């Protein structure tokens, strides 16, 4: 993908996280588990829902609209009618197929972006108190219990609190 994460440096998805599009898996002394990142998931859901709704919404309804009939000395106007209907059919078929193609690409790319940005967000919180594995995972140089983990997940991680300890294990 454009942003290199999904089907990228993170090879695959997690069938074990059923409650969100994006999130975290942790393992520590207290136990192990998945937790969805609520904010990014909900932002993406709202965005994509707005996209679909906006595609559907722009088709102001067709009010009652019908085919025309013609007598045997009206072939030219009948053909004008057919030219109009066929022409509109060409335009709407091309536009619908191509639009769906391009927007599908954009949606997938949007997800890839959201994953990369969540990863870099966590990365920028943790800095050198953890080492990047490379597969989307971070390994702590300090003990990080459940409260600490949740602090990481909600962006309230306290770097100075664990910096000295981290520095101790890193060296």
């Amino acid at each position: 993908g454009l942003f290199g994460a999904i089907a990228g440096f993170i090879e695959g998805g997690w069938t074990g996280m059923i409650d969100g599009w994006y999130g975290y898996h942790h393992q520590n002394e207290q136990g192990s588990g998945y937790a969805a990142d609520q904010k990014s998931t909900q932002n993406a859901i709202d965005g994509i829902t707005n996209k679909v709704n906006s595609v559907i919404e722009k088709m102001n309804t067709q009010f009652t609209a019908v085919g025309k009939e013609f007598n045997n000395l009206e072939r030219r106007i009948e053909n004008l009618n057919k030219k109009v209907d066929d022409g509109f059919l060409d335009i709407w078929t091309y536009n619908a197929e191509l639009l769906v193609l391009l927007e599908n690409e954009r949606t997938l790319d949007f997800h890839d972006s959201n994953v990369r940005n969540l990863y870099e967000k966590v990365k920028s919180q943790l800095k050198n108190n953890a080492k990047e594995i490379g597969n989307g995972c971070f390994e702590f140089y300090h003990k990080c219990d459940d409260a600490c983990m949740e602090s990481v997940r909600n962006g309230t991680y306290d770097y100075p609190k664990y910096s000295e300890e981290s520095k101790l294990n890193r060296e």
Partner: protein
């Protein structure tokens, strides 16, 4: 030539008579006279389709 046994022909004509107006028929032959007519209320954007599907 004959169609449905008849070498004669009949032409059919119609008109919409507006409210309050009068239509007058005069003839010395050949008139197929109105017997029943239809008073109409108008409405837009419909049309006719051909289908064998059940209503």
């Amino acid at each position: 030539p004959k169609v449905r046994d008849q070498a004669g022909r009949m032409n059919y004509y119609w008109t919409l008579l507006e409210p309050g107006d009068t239509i007058t028929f005069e003839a010395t032959g050949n008139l197929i006279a109105p017997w029943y007519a239809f008073a109409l209320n108008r409405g837009s954007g419909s049309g006719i389709i051909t289908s064998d599907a059940p209503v």
